[PDB]
Amino acid sequence: ELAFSPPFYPSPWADGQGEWADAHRRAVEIVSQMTLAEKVNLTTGTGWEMDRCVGQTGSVPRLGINWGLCGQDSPLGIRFSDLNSAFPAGTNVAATWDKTLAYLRGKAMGEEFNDKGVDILLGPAAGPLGKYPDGGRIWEGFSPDPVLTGVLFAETIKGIQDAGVIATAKHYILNEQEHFRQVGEAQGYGYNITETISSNVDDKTMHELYLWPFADAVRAGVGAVMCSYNQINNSYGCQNSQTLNKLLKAELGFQGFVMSDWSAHHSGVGAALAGLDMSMPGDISFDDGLSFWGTNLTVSVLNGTVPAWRVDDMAVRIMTAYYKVGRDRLRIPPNFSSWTRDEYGWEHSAVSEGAWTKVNDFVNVQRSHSQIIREIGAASTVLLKNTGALPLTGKEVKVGVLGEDAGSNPWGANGCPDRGCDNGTLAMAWGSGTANFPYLVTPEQAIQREVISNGGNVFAVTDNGALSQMADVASQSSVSLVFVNADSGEGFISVDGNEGDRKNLTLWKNGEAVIDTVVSHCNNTIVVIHSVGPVLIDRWYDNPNVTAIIWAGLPGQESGNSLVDVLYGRVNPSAKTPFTWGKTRESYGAPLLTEPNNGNGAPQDDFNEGVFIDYRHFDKRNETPIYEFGHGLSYTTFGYSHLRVQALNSAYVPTSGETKPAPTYGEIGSAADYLYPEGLKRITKFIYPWLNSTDLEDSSDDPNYGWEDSEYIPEGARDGSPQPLLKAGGAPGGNPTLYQDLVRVSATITNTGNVAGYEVPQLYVSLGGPNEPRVVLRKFDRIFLAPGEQKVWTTTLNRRDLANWDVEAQDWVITKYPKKVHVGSSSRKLPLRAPLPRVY
Amino acid sequence: ELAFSPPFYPSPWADGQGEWADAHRRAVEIVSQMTLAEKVNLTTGTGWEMDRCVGQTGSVPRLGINWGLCGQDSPLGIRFSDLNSAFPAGTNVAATWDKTLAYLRGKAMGEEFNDKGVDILLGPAAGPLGKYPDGGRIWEGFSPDPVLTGVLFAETIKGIQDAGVIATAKHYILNEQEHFRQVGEAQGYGYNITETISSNVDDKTMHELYLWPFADAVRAGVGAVMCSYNQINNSYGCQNSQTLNKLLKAELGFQGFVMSDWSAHHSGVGAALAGLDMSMPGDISFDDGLSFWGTNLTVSVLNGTVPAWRVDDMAVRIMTAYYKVGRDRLRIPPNFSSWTRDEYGWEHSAVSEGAWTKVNDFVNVQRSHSQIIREIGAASTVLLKNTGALPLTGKEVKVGVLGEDAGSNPWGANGCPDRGCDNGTLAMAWGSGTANFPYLVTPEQAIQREVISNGGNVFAVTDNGALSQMADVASQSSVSLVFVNADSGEGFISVDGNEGDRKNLTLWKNGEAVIDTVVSHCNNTIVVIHSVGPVLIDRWYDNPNVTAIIWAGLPGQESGNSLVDVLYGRVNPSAKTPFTWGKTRESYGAPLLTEPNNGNGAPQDDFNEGVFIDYRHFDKRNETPIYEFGHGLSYTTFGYSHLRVQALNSAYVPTSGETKPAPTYGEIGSAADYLYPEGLKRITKFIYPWLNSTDLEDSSDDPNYGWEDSEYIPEGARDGSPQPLLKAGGAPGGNPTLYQDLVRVSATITNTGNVAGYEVPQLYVSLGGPNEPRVVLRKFDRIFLAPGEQKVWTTTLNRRDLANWDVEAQDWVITKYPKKVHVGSSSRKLPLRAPLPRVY
Ligand SMILES: *[C@@H]1O[C@H](CO)[C@@H](O[C@@H]2O[C@H](CO)[C@@H](O[C@@H]3O[C@H](CO[C@H]4O[C@H](CO[C@H]5O[C@H](CO)[C@@H](O)[C@H](O)[C@@H]5O[C@H]5O[C@H](CO)[C@@H](O)[C@H](O)[C@@H]5O)[C@@H](O)[C@H](O[C@H]5O[C@H](CO)[C@@H](O)[C@H](O)[C@@H]5O[C@H]5O[C@H](CO)[C@@H](O)[C@H](O)[C@@H]5O)[C@@H]4O)[C@@H](O)[C@H](O[C@H]4O[C@H](CO)[C@@H](O)[C@H](O)[C@@H]4O[C@H]4O[C@H](CO)[C@@H](O)[C@H](O)[C@@H]4O[C@H]4O[C@H](CO)[C@@H](O)[C@H](O)[C@@H]4O)[C@@H]3O)[C@H](O)[C@H]2NC(C)=O)[C@H](O)[C@H]1NC(C)=O
Ligand SMILES: *[C@@H]1O[C@H](CO)[C@@H](O[C@@H]2O[C@H](CO)[C@@H](O[C@@H]3O[C@H](CO[C@H]4O[C@H](CO[C@H]5O[C@H](CO)[C@@H](O)[C@H](O)[C@@H]5O[C@H]5O[C@H](CO)[C@@H](O)[C@H](O)[C@@H]5O)[C@@H](O)[C@H](O[C@H]5O[C@H](CO)[C@@H](O)[C@H](O)[C@@H]5O)[C@@H]4O)[C@@H](O)[C@H](O[C@H]4O[C@H](CO)[C@@H](O)[C@H](O)[C@@H]4O[C@H]4O[C@H](CO)[C@@H](O)[C@H](O)[C@@H]4O)[C@@H]3O)[C@H](O)[C@H]2NC(C)=O)[C@H](O)[C@H]1NC(C)=O
Ligand SMILES: *[C@@H]1O[C@H](CO)[C@@H](O[C@@H]2O[C@H](CO)[C@@H](O[C@@H]3O[C@H](CO[C@H]4O[C@H](CO[C@H]5O[C@H](CO)[C@@H](O)[C@H](O)[C@@H]5O[C@H]5O[C@H](CO)[C@@H](O)[C@H](O)[C@@H]5O)[C@@H](O)[C@H](O[C@H]5O[C@H](CO)[C@@H](O)[C@H](O)[C@@H]5O)[C@@H]4O)[C@@H](O)[C@H](O[C@H]4O[C@H](CO)[C@@H](O)[C@H](O)[C@@H]4O[C@H]4O[C@H](CO)[C@@H](O)[C@H](O)[C@@H]4O)[C@@H]3O)[C@H](O)[C@H]2NC(C)=O)[C@H](O)[C@H]1NC(C)=O
Ligand SMILES: *[C@@H]1O[C@H](CO)[C@@H](O)[C@H](O)[C@H]1NC(C)=O
Ligand SMILES: *[C@@H]1O[C@H](CO)[C@@H](O)[C@H](O)[C@H]1NC(C)=O
């Protein structure tokens, strides 16, 4: 009955090909010098809260790796630190539709992480992709569209890695919701389950939707990939040989390392052989002093179960990432502590051991990164509706600012751990995807400053119970700006019954009544929404007193200043929604899985919609959104003309051949080489690589130690002989003939209005055939045009852009169905269209 | 037995002498043309909420007074309006010790009032003077010191009147507290009394303390005086022949008009003959449709009781004020409504009658008045303590801003009627002494802006219950700034049991615990107090972690900007405390009278301390204040040297002679002249001058109509013959030989530190003799000095400055006790001293 994940073995070994040759060579050179305990140190974290960073490996001080590799959250700024910046969330980056802004944000973040002593940034994210509009972590990623996500994910990775820090593509893969993601956490919420949720997805959907942005990340040169907490067809993400060995390593050709999510590692031998490379934070569960790896990995290799080539490959993949971004020349010891903001603390925080020492140096790493934050906030402010309220001119006599979302968090910008509250303006959602603010500029502050400077009077009512006081201010104002929000986050935090995932898609903090009060008293009401994702606005959006509506996402520390830049027209808004605004929750497709449906076994989440999420689903059901994917307004207008299409073919080459045999590097030795050194003071619960004695069974102490391999290990898992190459593989990101250009497309874009600004033209294709979506996004850019100016936008469609995943062939194939190309300003406003020429 | 107020009659008639000659002449010219109903219209308001302004008289359209004279609150900005400024409170002005700033604030206010169409500003105030540190309205005035108060009151009056608006010196006199000020209000608070509080004071104390600033106001040319709600020796303020006829009109030579406080008028004939000139808002009680004057005043003159010379004198005094400031050329109709902010409303708001019409024209009158407000706020920020925390340099790495008093009122700046709350930053206290803000710059906003511009990180915790959150921010900060407050107001509003008057002298909104939390976690804590008056700080002020303490008063709309100007040293603080900071409540003298002590008659408030209030009391009891009257710190130091004293080459001439007989102007006519015009639609409850019929008794309808004069009118009250001149009278402000200069005094002031700034030198005298305070303030200035610079400060002491009120002689006499002069930086730091030469 249950979804099954078939075996793919062995775990592919790194090949040092292409742009990875130099870093792999330097990795082989150092790993060839390492003993087994040194290798194991790289693969295994030293335990929860045992060092400075949220994750930290063992060290190799004999060879100059003098402190462990340090991994730190988050995808929008350094977590658990100080004197750092708080960037706009991923969903805002997607709303900019701007490759360059995604790159620069990545670079700015990389600089901060580097300057704090961090080796590995735990991000950015393209999983969750965005199947569920109420999924708790959708905002951390980019968009439910895989092409928008993959492009901006890849640019963000390149910025981070150009700054000298290893990026970690996460969460791989199908962790679309928070409910049932972890057994202990589910049990704490009162649910009786004994395994995590299983995401069950067909092979075509996997390739065409969820995997696609990870292909982009690999091709962009991402150093690490983080495996997820959920299962995929009932095999855990950190030991799923299909996703890790076959799709990521054999097909996408990934040459870096796979790192577990925190306590997502569920077996020693099983995970190592199924493609895991690094166990974080290193213990079985936080501070239990046990490890699936560490000592157990040393023993698994000494007893012959995990071949030497596999542990050698782990250490090579890790060191390859290290050398690829230059950690050997850039790394400095972490100069802050995740676990306290005090100057002094215990060296090993979890157990109060080691030296009482200076754990925070107070190093300011902000530089002028406030400028890119302000910029991105303004370029991610989506103007959804504008019947002439905007821009503001500075001649407004009285301005009202209404709603708690305009005001300060009265507990301070950092006053709730992991931002686990919805107090004041919503500039950052909750969980591990967070950073501490250096400050937070509110809409109230920025609007008040600006109104005053223009001679206006201005009043801010920020108590969402004070409805009569709001009504009076609204009645007296020339324009009323009303602020509302909706929040969500990671599932280890629940705010008002939202257990990560949101329990509805409507407004928080009495926002529905706030809107009603203001709109019924002011015929020039502008609604500004800060939110993690879509909100159901059908009830009020079309009221004629609502003269403009803005979605500004989660803008980070410069929130108010970004917003006023757009309100007053210093920046002409250009952002487009990176998701659909539907009429009802049901319009989006299936609800979250929030009740166990497989007894007390793993809840089963069948991805029955296949590729049809967000706009694809609305298009297939012929549903009319309130605001479609790709919609946003400008203070000017843009016209589209002169579509031209030209074939370039001049062929796909399915990859054929064999790998090398699995190499080994560095002598393994025997148990007598790997005892705990005499005179080493063992730190309580710290995870080490060493053995209590030369008796391997006693040093491991596994209760099932020593079975025949075939009782618990799949066939081929230990086979280091040459393996066949997969047809759809061949280079990082897949077969390189996928990236050959087949068609060139041009369209002329004209600023047909009176104000300079950026437009986001979009190019969609129809691949044809029964059950293909009517249109799917393939190209976009953000282009600046003065009034009356024209530019010719030219792009190319490659083989992969026009292909479908053919499950019978196990390859990408351009089908025989007739295709079309469409260019315009959104997924529904597509005035240019033409047939594509036949290419294969 | 009970305090008694002896008769002084007749009510002195205006004489047109000196600077008043031109305006009195025009008043006579116009009043000589008026009929009796026209005269009565000037004297009598038209009823509560019957027109645009808080008070409005009848009109005289036949002679070009085409709408009634408009009186509007408040002493710190226009009340019940829009598009106006909100100025620092009177207590802030006193803290500046700066004559020019006081003048400029009055001028800025006058400009706003004039441009809204208002004739008469209901302010400024010198009553309450400040006998009670917990008195509810002490912040509206200046200082408990009569000289600091009189000088700044006079400069405020001059500014207002130089802008073309009549100033109203209030409240005259001895309304030192709010408890029992009004019968109906006291009964609403559960007290059983049938008359208002009687303030009972000896003659010398009256002259040397409470009356002294009113002398200053009269000499400065104030057009109106407002009489008080309380009794003086058991005769109501608005019919007290001693205070109105004798002290104000006969002795101080006042040539303007006396106006009642609102519903403070308590009889027709009695009050007219005792010296009242204008009844506001014109009804007996609000909207009862009855008047002690109006119809009743017409009848009182027609029946022979109130002589024609008295009603003629009322009209002449009112018109003298109107001409003195130029209302004939400057007046425009009021262009706002006090009773609604909507554009449209009923012409007569109280009864919804007259036309439905445009009552608000939305005229902006702010100009650049924000500049003088910011300036006065900075110049009123008293630096009480500084052990090196200030000024801030911009190098602070992390800045904490703690306390609700830093943050916004979440109901909006104008979210509580008459500011009757203590939400967010305290920039204005409550009651009639208020204005609506155009905006309000909080300390949070301004500090955050400034820190961010310097590269600091900044966090604001504004929930006074969030103590652990404040502790964590305080622990992490380089400097913590903690904001606390204490509020009070007029007695028609009670907040948390403070029935106008404050129920204690300690902090509001959990401030004592906020200070404890911050100071116990940060060794560089700056405390900023916003308050109506003194707060008891003995418990925490001397904690060595409190590195500075500021009292910033009630700074109006620019609060946060005024403050950051001083914090960062753009302004070098120069303010001095205008009251004493004592150790205990008892240190100040007698408690408020808060329980009835005379059965259910008038509570009796005996002013037994005489001239010994505030610093005079501390000095007489040899108590050590925490911070003495006149204390404030600078970022530099000032030295005092080279005292020189010289008797002037240059006697007092007691006034002797007689007045003119009382004049009459305009023919009175008879009852048939003063019927309601045929076809005039009478507005419900509006107050008119006219008679229902020629039967005077029926038109009046007084239940005790028609007694013989001697049964209810004191002897002399109807005597229009020539009267003796009082010895201590002779010109506005009293005998002009009081103001002859007798001694010149010089002292050299040096800036002995390294920062430019203003110093406030102070000159005190000891008048000598057993009954006399050790020192009393006589002269002060604010003088700017560059580092190392010296200036010679020269001033003159006049006859009044060295005199005592001699009760036997009923005159000012320089006594034969030896006197001394003292110069220095506070009432206690007086390094220069010398005997004064004998002068008389
Ligand atoms: C014209 O026309 C006109 C118009 O119309 C008119 O007029 C009118 O007139 C009438 C008569 O006729 C009147 O009436 C009256 O009045 C009175 C007054 O009153 C007021 O005042 C008071 C006070 O007084 C005082 O002061 C003043 C000033 O300020 C003066 O003026 C006076 O004279 C006096 O003097 C005194 O003192 C002083 C000090 O203080 C000094 O300085 C001097 O020298 C002297 O000594 C007051 O009190 C009052 O008050 C009240 O009222 C009010 C209002 O409402 C209120 O608010 C308050 O609070 C109060 O109240 C209370 O009281 C009340 C009753 O009265 C009740 O109801 C309540 O509840 C409460 O409790 C006023 O302000 C009067 O007095 C009178 O009466 C009387 O009598 C009756 C009857 O019998 C009674 O009932 C009452 O009670 C009273 O009694 C008293 O007196 C008597 C005698 O006279 C006696 O016997 C008794 O015992 C008693 O005694 C006591 O007290 C007193 C005081 O009061 C004292 O002095 C003693 O010693 C004791 O202790 C009557 O009412 C009217 O007003 C008029 N009106 C108008 C509109 O103006 C005419 O008439 C015509 N003519 C022809 C020819 O036709
Ligand atoms: C989707 O998911 C969302 C996220 O999980 C979820 O969000 C939640 O939404 C609900 C609403 O749907 C929110 O709850 C509402 O919050 C309102 C605002 O609460 C705050 O303000 C209150 C009012 O304060 C005024 O009144 C006080 C009492 O007089 C004064 O003390 C105040 O000074 C203030 O004054 C103003 O009003 C005075 C007149 O009352 C006036 O004189 C004065 O001048 C001035 O104008 C506070 O009381 C409240 O604080 C109390 O309650 C909270 C908990 O709710 C405590 O933490 C506090 O300690 C304190 O006890 C807040 O500060 C509420 O007004 C609203 O109440 C109404 O509904 C509740 C039950 O639902 C009733 O008990 C109550 O009587 C109210 O009924 C009225 O309205 C309802 C419509 O809602 C109507 O049916 C009814 O007939 C009646 O008219 C309610 O609690 C909640 O905060 C959101 N949570 C989060 C985390 O965001 C959302 O629900 C989900 N969507 C759906 C559809 O499921
Ligand atoms: C002189 O004249 C002055 C002017 O009139 C006069 O002023 C008044 O002073 C008093 C005393 O200082 C003031 O009243 C105090 O106000 C404090 C703050 O109130 C606000 O915050 C409260 C706490 O909020 C936190 O806790 C809540 C409950 O857990 C949470 O829901 C919140 O989210 C918040 O969280 C923080 O703390 C949590 C731990 O608790 C923590 O988990 C979290 O992370 C975070 O850190 C709120 O409860 C309160 O709101 C409630 O109550 C008010 C009424 O007070 C209602 O209007 C609200 O609707 C709501 O129901 C406010 O928002 C209070 O902490 C303090 O409480 C203490 O005293 C009362 C009795 O007086 C006890 O019932 C209470 O248990 C507390 O006891 C503790 O402290 C006292 C010390 O006072 C101690 O003796 C005792 O042993 C114990 O330790 C108190 O109410 C008042 O506001 C002032 N009024 C004005 C107008 O300014 C002054 O008193 C006069 N002077 C004298 C000496 O007479
Ligand atoms: C709003 O209403 C007013 C009066 O009802 C009208 O004059 C104005 O044109 C309206 N403005 C908008 C935004 O339509
Ligand atoms: C406060 O404490 C710090 C401890 O780091 C100390 O270095 C500093 O000199 C102290 N400053 C004051 C204001 O005394």
Short mmCIF file of C-alpha atoms in Angstrom, two decimals, chain B residues 91 94-95 97 129-135 138 142-146 148 382 384 502 505 529 531-538 551 576-589 611-632 762 764 774-777 826-829:
data_model
loop_
_atom_site.label_atom_id
_atom_site.label_comp_id
_atom_site.label_asym_id
_atom_site.label_seq_id
_atom_site.Cartn_x
_atom_site.Cartn_y
_atom_site.Cartn_z
CA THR B 91 6.97 75.39 33.72
CA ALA B 94 10.45 79.13 33.67
CA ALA B 95 13.20 76.47 33.41
CA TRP B 97 15.26 81.51 32.76
CA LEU B 129 1.81 80.25 41.61
CA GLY B 130 3.05 76.91 43.02
CA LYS B 131 2.48 76.69 46.80
CA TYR B 132 1.71 72.97 46.47
CA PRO B 133 4.20 70.77 44.62
CA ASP B 134 1.32 68.33 43.97
CA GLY B 135 -1.12 71.08 42.86
CA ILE B 138 1.21 74.33 38.66
CA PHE B 142 5.84 79.50 35.68
CA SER B 143 7.43 78.97 39.06
CA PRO B 144 6.65 79.22 42.76
CA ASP B 145 9.09 82.13 42.86
CA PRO B 146 7.19 85.36 42.31
CA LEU B 148 10.90 84.48 38.03
CA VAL B 382 17.60 70.67 33.06
CA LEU B 384 20.41 67.76 37.29
CA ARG B 502 -1.56 64.49 42.22
CA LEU B 505 4.97 62.84 44.20
CA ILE B 529 12.01 62.65 33.66
CA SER B 531 6.79 65.76 34.60
CA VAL B 532 4.42 68.47 35.75
CA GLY B 533 6.57 69.37 38.72
CA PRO B 534 8.83 67.85 41.36
CA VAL B 535 9.21 64.14 41.79
CA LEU B 536 10.74 62.49 44.94
CA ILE B 537 13.95 60.98 43.73
CA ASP B 538 15.82 60.31 46.96
CA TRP B 551 14.20 66.91 33.98
CA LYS B 576 17.87 75.63 35.91
CA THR B 577 15.22 74.02 37.99
CA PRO B 578 12.43 76.58 38.68
CA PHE B 579 11.39 74.65 41.78
CA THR B 580 13.09 72.65 44.59
CA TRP B 581 13.71 68.84 44.49
CA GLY B 582 13.13 67.83 48.07
CA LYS B 583 13.71 64.64 50.05
CA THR B 584 10.13 64.03 51.14
CA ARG B 585 6.65 65.47 50.48
CA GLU B 586 6.67 66.93 54.00
CA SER B 587 9.86 68.91 53.14
CA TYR B 588 7.75 71.26 50.98
CA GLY B 589 5.25 72.28 53.67
CA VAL B 611 5.84 83.93 51.99
CA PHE B 612 7.68 80.71 52.79
CA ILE B 613 6.93 78.42 49.85
CA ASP B 614 9.37 76.30 47.90
CA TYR B 615 13.00 77.36 48.47
CA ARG B 616 12.03 79.98 51.04
CA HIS B 617 10.55 77.18 53.15
CA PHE B 618 13.50 74.85 52.74
CA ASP B 619 15.85 77.71 53.75
CA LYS B 620 13.80 78.75 56.81
CA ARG B 621 13.69 75.13 58.10
CA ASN B 622 17.40 74.66 57.23
CA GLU B 623 16.42 71.58 55.13
CA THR B 624 18.88 70.37 52.48
CA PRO B 625 17.26 69.84 49.12
CA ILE B 626 18.40 67.15 46.70
CA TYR B 627 18.53 69.93 44.03
CA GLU B 628 17.97 73.52 45.04
CA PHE B 629 15.91 76.12 43.26
CA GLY B 630 18.14 77.53 40.50
CA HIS B 631 20.34 74.45 40.09
CA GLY B 632 21.38 73.12 36.68
CA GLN B 762 21.20 84.85 39.72
CA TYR B 764 19.32 87.28 45.50
CA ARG B 774 17.20 84.43 54.22
CA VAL B 775 17.39 85.04 50.46
CA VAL B 776 14.86 85.97 47.73
CA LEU B 777 15.52 86.00 44.01
CA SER B 826 21.70 78.86 42.35
CA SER B 827 19.81 79.76 45.51
CA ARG B 828 22.48 77.87 47.48
CA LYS B 829 25.70 78.50 45.45
#
